[PDB]
């Protein structure tokens, strides 16, 4: 319990300050460990409440300990800011913001589960902020009580967990920081049980056995970990796990640190009442009062807390190893600062100079009980902030030249953020964490306060600006459609970054910048904008139905009358030609002569075939054609309209599963009609032509084509590797890798492989890659559309079931009428 004066005095010696947080996978004990720290060293002031965002700890080290600190120290008192970090670990920017205001981290790892993805994710983000890590292998009690594990097994488990961790560190830590790996012998690894309240470092044991083995602890802690053995027979320390005779030697870690602990557990839990007093006496543990009566776990919990208080182990690593702001801001300055590295503000950050202009980073806005008011939480990197001080509030889009996001206003009050409470203070110098009241309106989320007109903004969060996340929206009650269509308009108008359009398959699509953005949009659309139950789902992907080769044999079909017959074959239309039709070089209404000259001279077509195209389809202009190759059919001219109409019908609804055809050419080889027009009416010939077309189609090695996106991704070099990793998992294909900004990888990504892509990409690039996608072209899947188990077939079977059609695709024989 300190007074505002004591706190302010503590905050002057930033050399003795430690800004850090606890990194842990859910359930690994992050909470009970901080409760332990708070109960042991928490600080409290000697009716407005807030959400606990940070806690202050106080610690004193012995004069000898302080000498061991490899960094500028002023006295034996230390102020530790334990900063709260979100629990969402998706490489989110909320987490990055929280870490940004810290310099060191206490990483919690489970004895049994070891390092899990969640752990790797926050640690990776932390390393990206040049944060120094220190580890605590937690839940050790489980291995002793539940699993009955042996000393060497426990050792091995510890060593493997430490290795897993230093793999992540060696991979993502900036080489400029040197070796930021963790070493038990150097005291950067603690072992214990946050629930039982005990933990230790090799250092503490070295201190305990140094003055006992007649050796300095520097020598002792190297010997208390890894391959160091003490042969009681020779009384010597060696690095060989066997003696001269070759007999097995027990590792020093097991023999001097684990065994005493193992013996305490075994004796106390088995009620060996004549073995416990001696063991406790030897370890110099003293039970007082009612404690002398405890037994079992109760006695154990109490004995271990006295023998190795947890908080003590943790505070030791924090003070001795985690960097102070002075130490850290020296190598973190440039990243933190967007401006010039030679800039006056950057230098003030490197020096953690309290007399320079203000450079205060706003980490986030915290909820208070002061009727809808949010206090700004952050860290003073340069200068000192004062109550009633005129400062310059610069949002995420501010630039020294423009007046965007700029907001000059006085800071109403500077408060200490102590748990759920606040404490008004007059000022706060560089190196400290602090809360600002009165910044609510001008800043929401991150920002940057300065007292210099030149001041550049501190590292801002990079956010997506492309509608890469999209879903299909539909009313649960058909009659509501009008409100939905209206709601989308209202939604679009209110949000610049939101996009809505109708898909090729007839679904309303709503797309957002990121998953979160899209979620707000859908919530607002459903609740306000449209105000009606909406149904959300992955947009249906549209496909095309084409042929890979000519009909293996003439297609023959007759009319209902059985009097008329059409003979035809289908063949592929070249992509360049389909494209030419789709894009305007070859047009439905152009003069057939000039068009045929182009198709023949420039595209390899036979000019007679070209001069004889009867129509394009579907809709009279699609990339499918009917060419007349008949020789002496008498009443040909009279059935033309029926044939054309049937084609518009056939190309609009393919026989594979009802999708439109594309790149399909149909050659009419011959037609036999009835002499009297009354048996050659459209009602007779339209079905014939459609039936024959479907047959020629199916006889031409049918295939479906899928939509393919052109995806453009901006990101930093070291992250590019994740891009290729994801793409390869999604039938992707790289197109171009260009560039002294970032990189930009361009690739083709099948549309049916893009649902959730944005998520898997941030996950594979540590949230550093930013996707952009636009429809590019159609691609023919080589697999059999009629084989329910091939890639194409699965897609066809899913669409058929979804539409209530029979599963089996009718084969060509179903449309062929034998002579
Ligand atoms: C500017 O934003 C763009 C990009 O997001 C992208 O080009 C997107 O693509 C939409 C699709 C466009 C394709 C062409 C019209 C023909 C095939 C169409 C698609 C159907 O599967 C592929 C993509 C993704 C779609 C379905 C799944 C919605 C498309 C559609 O509109 O149905 O369109 C919007 C407007
Ligand atoms: N056996 C054991 N359980 C623990 C230990 N520390 C925490 N737990 C338990 O693990 C669960 C999650 O703990 P908590 O501190 O909330 O973890 P967090 O959510 O990651 O912060 C709770 O049921 C705890 O009682 C420990 O050292 N040993
Ligand atoms: Mg917790």
């Amino acid at each position: 319990a300190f007074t505002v004066d004591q706190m302010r005095s503590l905050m002057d010696k930033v050399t003795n300050v430690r800004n850090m947080s606890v990194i842990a996978h859910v359930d690994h004990g992050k909470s009970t460990l901080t409760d332990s720290l708070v109960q042991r060293a928490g600080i409290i002031s000697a009716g407005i409440t807030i959400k606990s965002t940070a806690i202050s700890l106080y610690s004193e080290m012995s004069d000898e300990d302080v000498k061991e600190i490899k960094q500028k120290t002023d006295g034996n008192s230390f102020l530790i800011n334990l900063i709260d970090s979100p629990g969402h670990v998706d490489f989110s920017s909320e987490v990055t913001a929280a870490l940004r205001v810290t310099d060191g981290a206490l990483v919690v790892v489970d004895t049994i589960e070891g390092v899990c993805v969640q752990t790797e994710t926050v640690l990776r983000q932390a390393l990206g902020e040049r944060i120094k890590p220190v580890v605590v292998i937690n839940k050790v009690d489980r291995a002793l009580l539940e699993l009955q594990v042996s000393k060497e097994d426990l050792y091995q488990t510890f060593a493997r967990t430490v290795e897993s961790v230093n793999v992540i560190v060696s991979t993502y830590a900036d080489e400029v920081l040197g070796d930021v790996q963790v070493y038990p012998a150097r005291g950067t690894v603690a072992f214990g049980s946050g629930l039982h309240g005990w933990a230790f470092t090799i250092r503490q044991f070295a201190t305990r056995y140094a003055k006992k083995f007649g050796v300095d602890k520097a020598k002792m802690m190297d010997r208390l970990w890894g391959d160091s053995f003490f042969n009681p027979k020779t009384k010597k320390w060696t690095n060989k796990d066997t003696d001269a005779e070759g007999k097995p030697l027990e590792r020093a870690f097991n023999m001097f640190i684990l065994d005493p602990i193992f013996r305490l557990f075994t004796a106390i839990m088995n009620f060996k009442k004549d073995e416990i007093p001696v063991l406790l006496e030897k370890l110099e543990i003293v039970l007082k009062g009612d404690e002398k009566d405890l037994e079992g776990k109760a006695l154990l919990k109490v004995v271990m807390r006295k023998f190795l208080p947890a908080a003590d182990a943790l505070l030791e690593m924090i003070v001795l190893h985690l960097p102070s702001p002075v130490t850290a801001q020296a190598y973190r300055a440039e990243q933190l600062y967007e401006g010039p590295a030679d800039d006056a503000n950057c230098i003030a950050i490197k020096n953690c100079d309290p007399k320079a202009d203000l450079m205060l980073y706003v980490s986030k806005m915290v909820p208070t009980s002061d009727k809808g008011r949010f206090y700004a939480f952050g860290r003073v990197f340069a200068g000192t902030v004062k109550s009633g001080q005129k400062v310059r509030i610069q949002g995420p889009n501010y630039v020294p030249g423009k007046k965007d996001d700029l907001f000059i206003k006085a800071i109403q009050r500077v408060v200490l953020m102590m748990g759920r409470f606040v404490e008004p203070i007059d000022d706060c110098p560089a190196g400290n964490i602090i809360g600002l009241v009165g910044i609510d309106q001008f800043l929401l989320k991150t920002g940057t306060l300065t007292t210099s007109e030149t001041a550049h903004n501190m590292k801002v969060m990079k956010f997506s600006v492309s509608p890469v996340v999209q879903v299909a929206v539909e009313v649960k009650n058909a009659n509501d459609l009008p409100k939905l269509v209206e709601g989308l308009k209202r939604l679009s108008k209110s949000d610049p970054c939101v996009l809505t359009y109708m898909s090729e398959s007839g679904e309303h699509i709503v797309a957002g910048t990121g998953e979160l953005h899209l979620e707000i949009c859908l919530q607002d659309l459903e609740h306000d904008h449209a105000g009606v139950p909406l149904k959300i789902s992955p947009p249906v992907v549209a496909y095309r139905e084409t042929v890979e080769s000519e009909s293996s044999q003439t297609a023959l079909s007759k009319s209902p009358n059985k009097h008329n017959r059409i003979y035809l074959k289908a063949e592929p239309i070249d992509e360049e030609v389909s494209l030419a039709i789709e894009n305007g070089i070859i047009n439905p209404r152009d003069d057939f002569k000039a068009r045929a000259r182009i198709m023949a001279d420039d595209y390899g077509w036979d000019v007679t075939d070209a001069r004889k195209i009867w129509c394009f389809g579907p809709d009279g202009n699609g990339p499918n054609l009917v060419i007349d190759q008949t020789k002496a059919v008498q009443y040909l001219h009279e059935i033309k309209d029926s044939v054309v109409a049937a084609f518009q019908w056939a190309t609009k609804e393919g026989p594979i599963f009802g999708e439109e055809m594309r790149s399909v050419r149909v050659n009419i080889l011959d037609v036999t009609l009835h002499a009297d027009a009354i048996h050659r009416g459209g009602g007779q010939i339209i079905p014939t032509m459609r039936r024959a077309t479907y047959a020629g189609f199916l006889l031409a090695d049918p295939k479906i084509q899928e939509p393919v996106f052109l995806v453009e991704i901006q990101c930093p070099e070291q992250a590019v590797g994740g891009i290729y990793s994801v793409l390869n998992k999604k039938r992707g294909q790289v197109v171009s890798e260009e560039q002294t900004p970032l990189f930009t990888v361009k690739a083709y990504l099948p549309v049916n492989e893009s649902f959730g892509f944005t998520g898997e990409l941030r996950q594979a690039t540590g949230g550093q890659a930013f996707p952009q996608m636009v429809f590019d072209h159609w691609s023919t899947l080589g697999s059999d559309p009629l084989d329910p188990t091939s890639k194409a077939g699965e897609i066809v079977l899913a669409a058929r079931k979804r539409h209530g059609m029979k599963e089996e695709v009718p084969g060509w024989q179903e449309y062929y009428d034998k002579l």
Side-chain angles (χ1 to χ4, degrees):
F2 292 138
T3 71
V4 174
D5 286 286
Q6 286 183 287
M7 284 298 280
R8 184 63 184 71
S9 174
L10 230 37
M11 298 161 78
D12 270 318
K13 303 170 190 174
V14 290
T15 44
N16 289 55
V17 166
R18 297 286 185 286
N19 300 139
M20 54 74 79
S21 66
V22 185
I23 295 185
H25 184 299
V26 261
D27 298 298
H28 283 202
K30 170 165 162 182
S31 294
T32 80
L33 279 183
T34 79
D35 287 339
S36 165
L37 279 180
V38 171
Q39 291 189 300
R40 167 73 166 88
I43 298 178
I44 297 170
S45 289
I48 279 178
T49 48
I50 61 172
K51 163 176 171 44
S52 184
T53 309
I55 315 170
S56 304
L57 268 38
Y58 176 82
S59 181
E60 306 192 313
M61 297 283 114
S62 74
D63 288 293
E64 79 165 298
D65 284 356
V66 173
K67 280 187 180 180
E68 288 182 48
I69 305 173
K70 295 183 181 181
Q71 84 192 272
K72 217 169 303 174
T73 302
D74 180 358
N76 303 355
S77 284
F78 298 92
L79 168 63
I80 301 166
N81 294 126
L82 198 71
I83 302 170
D84 186 44
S85 56
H88 45 94
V89 275
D90 55 77
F91 279 106
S92 73
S93 57
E94 335 303 351
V95 177
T96 292
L99 294 168
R100 190 150 297 168
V101 303
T102 68
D103 301 314
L106 166 58
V107 189
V108 186
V109 181
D110 187 69
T111 288
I112 297 186
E113 299 179 11
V115 187
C116 305
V117 295
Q118 244 176 56
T119 310
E120 181 185 306
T121 292
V122 183
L123 175 53
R124 183 183 174 179
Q125 275 171 287
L127 295 174
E129 297 296 305
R130 288 191 186 196
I131 293 164
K132 184 185 184 180
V134 128
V135 169
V136 180
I137 300 182
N138 193 36
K139 258 88 134 62
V140 176
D141 65 90
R142 274 226 266 186
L144 310 185
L145 266 23
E146 294 161 50
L147 286 59
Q148 304 181 306
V149 190
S150 76
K151 294 178 295 178
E152 186 60 17
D153 295 325
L154 182 47
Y155 171 70
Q156 288 303 325
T157 301
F158 287 163
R160 290 197 299 274
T161 295
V162 172
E163 229 304 62
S164 301
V165 172
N166 291 335
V167 150
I168 294 169
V169 173
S170 61
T171 289
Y172 301 97
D174 283 52
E175 310 171 306
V176 187
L177 288 52
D179 187 348
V180 64
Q181 284 183 118
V182 176
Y183 299 101
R186 300 181 191 181
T188 50
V189 180
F191 309 85
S193 171
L195 178 76
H196 288 358
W198 64 269
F200 70 81
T201 57
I202 301 290
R203 186 173 182 307
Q204 299 181 305
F205 270 102
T207 288
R208 181 186 301 255
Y209 304 147
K211 259 184 175 178
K212 255 176 195 175
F213 261 95
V215 182
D216 60 56
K217 53 178 157 189
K219 187 60 184 177
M220 274 311 265
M221 44 189 82
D222 286 319
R223 292 178 169 177
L224 287 179
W225 173 263
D227 295 339
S228 265
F229 308 74
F230 175 73
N231 195 327
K233 292 176 179 179
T234 65
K235 294 299 197 178
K236 287 171 187 171
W237 298 81
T238 174
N239 301 307
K240 267 185 54 185
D241 56 31
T242 63
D243 57 19
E245 292 64 58
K247 301 177 188 177
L249 292 182
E250 173 181 47
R251 173 192 310 302
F253 179 75
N254 290 20
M255 183 182 156
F256 293 118
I257 292 169
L258 294 183
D259 200 69
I261 291 175
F262 272 60
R263 283 186 280 187
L264 277 173
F265 274 52
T266 302
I268 296 177
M269 295 304 281
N270 287 303
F271 302 88
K272 303 175 174 186
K273 55 175 181 169
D274 296 317
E275 290 175 45
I276 300 175
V278 175
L279 203 52
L280 272 54
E281 190 164 303
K282 291 181 179 175
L283 291 175
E284 303 195 325
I285 309 296
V286 286
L287 300 177
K288 62 185 185 304
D290 292 6
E291 310 180 311
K292 300 179 184 179
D293 300 318
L294 308 168
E295 302 183 284
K297 300 174 194 174
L299 179 57
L300 186 68
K301 293 183 178 183
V302 170
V303 161
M304 295 285 81
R305 288 171 180 288
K306 279 176 174 293
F307 179 33
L308 301 154
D312 285 10
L314 310 180
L315 294 164
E316 190 192 85
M317 296 186 306
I318 291 166
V319 172
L320 294 187
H321 301 290
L322 297 187
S324 69
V326 173
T327 296
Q329 303 195 181
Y331 55 70
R332 236 150 69 72
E334 302 186 309
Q335 298 199 312
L336 293 167
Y337 195 53
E338 293 291 320
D342 61 75
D343 170 84
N345 307 83
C346 188
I347 300 299
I349 304 300
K350 305 209 177 192
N351 306 326
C352 188
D353 189 344
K355 295 180 174 179
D357 282 312
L358 179 62
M359 286 307 283
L360 193 171
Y361 179 77
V362 164
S363 197
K364 74 178 177 184
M365 297 297 318
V366 41
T368 78
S369 62
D370 192 305
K371 303 306 174 186
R373 299 288 278 165
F374 290 59
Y375 292 1
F377 173 72
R379 167 171 168 177
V380 184
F381 280 97
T384 85
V385 69
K386 311 173 188 171
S387 300
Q389 175 184 65
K390 278 182 176 182
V391 194
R392 288 154 43 81
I393 306 182
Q394 326 187 328
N397 300 296
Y398 176 104
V399 176
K402 312 177 186 299
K403 28 182 176 178
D404 48 16
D405 264 310
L406 173 55
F407 296 102
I408 298 181
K409 219 60 184 172
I411 295 184
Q412 297 171 35
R413 214 93 169 79
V414 170
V415 305
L416 291 178
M417 302 283 251
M418 318 234 277
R420 298 190 307 133
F421 310 104
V422 292
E423 198 57 58
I425 208 163
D426 295 318
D427 50 56
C428 173
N432 295 283
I433 268 66
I434 198 71
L436 304 173
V437 26
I439 311 299
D440 318 50
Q441 55 286 350
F442 310 114
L443 219 62
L444 292 181
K445 259 201 172 191
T446 65
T448 302
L449 275 62
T450 65
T451 209
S452 161
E453 207 173 2
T454 287
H456 241 100
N457 238 279
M458 292 188 79
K459 191 174 185 184
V460 286
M461 298 294 78
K462 306 185 240 64
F463 43 61
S464 178
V465 291
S466 299
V468 294
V469 189
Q470 344 187 307
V471 292
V473 188
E474 174 194 53
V475 303
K476 297 196 178 189
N477 182 297
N479 308 294
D480 290 302
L481 290 170
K483 305 176 184 176
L484 168 50
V485 177
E486 179 51 51
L488 296 172
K489 298 184 179 182
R490 287 176 175 169
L491 165 60
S492 299
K493 298 174 187 175
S494 63
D495 202 311
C497 290
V498 75
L499 171 66
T500 58
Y501 65 87
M502 186 113 248
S503 81
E504 184 70 5
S505 302
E507 291 186 304
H508 293 282
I509 306 302
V510 173
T513 276
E515 303 99 304
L516 180 47
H517 181 226
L518 176 60
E519 169 178 275
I520 311 305
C521 288
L522 291 181
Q523 298 170 326
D524 294 332
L525 172 66
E526 173 158 41
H527 193 277
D528 310 316
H529 301 305
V532 177
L534 299 184
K535 176 175 185 163
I536 306 304
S537 53
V540 163
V541 180
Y543 294 86
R544 254 25 157 186
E545 288 188 37
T546 192
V547 299
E548 196 85 288
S549 66
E550 173 174 47
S551 305
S552 63
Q553 63 177 290
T554 293
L556 173 60
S557 302
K558 69 197 177 192
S559 51
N561 268 146
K562 292 187 175 178
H563 293 80
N564 308 287
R565 294 205 164 207
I566 288 181
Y567 294 82
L568 63 80
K569 285 187 181 184
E571 68 176 306
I573 288 179
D574 201 285
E575 250 299 306
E576 241 274 42
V577 172
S578 291
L579 255 29
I581 293 164
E582 282 158 354
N583 294 292
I585 291 79
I586 297 181
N587 313 282
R589 312 315 164 200
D590 290 315
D591 161 65
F592 87 101
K593 180 173 67 171
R595 177 177 63 206
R597 270 270 67 87
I598 286 177
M599 296 195 255
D601 304 340
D602 295 296
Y603 290 91
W605 270 60
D606 168 80
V607 79
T608 294
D609 280 346
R611 299 177 88 261
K612 287 186 170 187
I613 96 86
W614 266 16
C615 62
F616 292 60
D619 314 297
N621 60 29
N624 301 283
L625 304 157
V626 173
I627 282 53
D628 161 30
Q629 299 190 318
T630 65
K631 288 166 193 162
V633 180
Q634 277 181 56
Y635 309 108
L636 189 66
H637 61 298
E638 304 189 305
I639 70 171
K640 194 184 182 183
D641 288 338
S642 293
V643 178
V644 168
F647 196 60
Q648 301 312 313
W649 194 354
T651 62
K652 180 65 176 178
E653 177 185 55
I656 294 176
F657 65 127
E659 286 296 280
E660 289 174 20
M661 291 185 165
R662 172 159 196 282
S663 297
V664 176
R665 171 172 168 183
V666 170
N667 299 304
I668 300 176
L669 302 180
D670 186 42
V671 184
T672 59
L673 308 169
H674 179 72
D676 320 308
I678 198 170
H679 301 292
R680 312 182 313 245
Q684 285 298 321
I685 295 178
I686 289 179
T688 310
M689 177 54 185
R690 170 166 138 117
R691 194 175 152 70
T693 290
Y694 287 157
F697 179 93
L698 263 0
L699 271 171
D701 194 32
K703 250 75 171 167
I704 68 167
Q705 298 188 313
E706 75 184 320
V708 175
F709 274 143
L710 175 57
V711 62
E712 190 190 317
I713 307 170
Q714 264 84 13
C715 72
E717 176 163 48
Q718 5 68 289
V720 172
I723 295 177
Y724 298 122
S725 177
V726 182
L727 292 176
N728 299 328
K729 303 190 181 184
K730 305 195 172 304
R731 302 188 296 102
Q733 168 188 337
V734 193
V735 172
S736 69
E737 182 188 301
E738 22 176 342
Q739 308 181 348
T740 312
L742 320 173
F743 278 81
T744 64
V745 182
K746 284 186 172 183
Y748 287 138
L749 176 69
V751 175
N752 62 27
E753 296 286 328
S754 63
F755 304 131
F757 175 80
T758 184
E760 289 189 58
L761 179 67
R762 61 160 170 57
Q763 196 57 51
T765 69
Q768 295 179 281
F770 290 99
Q772 197 175 307
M773 315 178 315
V774 72
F775 170 67
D776 189 81
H777 60 265
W778 290 98
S779 175
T780 311
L781 291 174
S783 39
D784 190 316
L786 283 48
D787 173 356
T789 54
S790 65
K791 292 199 177 182
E794 305 193 308
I795 296 174
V796 168
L797 178 58
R800 283 189 147 272
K801 294 206 279 188
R802 194 172 71 251
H803 291 305
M805 302 167 77
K806 173 66 283 178
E807 298 190 0
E808 300 183 306
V809 169
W812 69 267
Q813 301 86 336
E814 298 291 299
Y815 308 84
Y816 191 86
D817 300 315
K818 199 172 191 177
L819 264 172

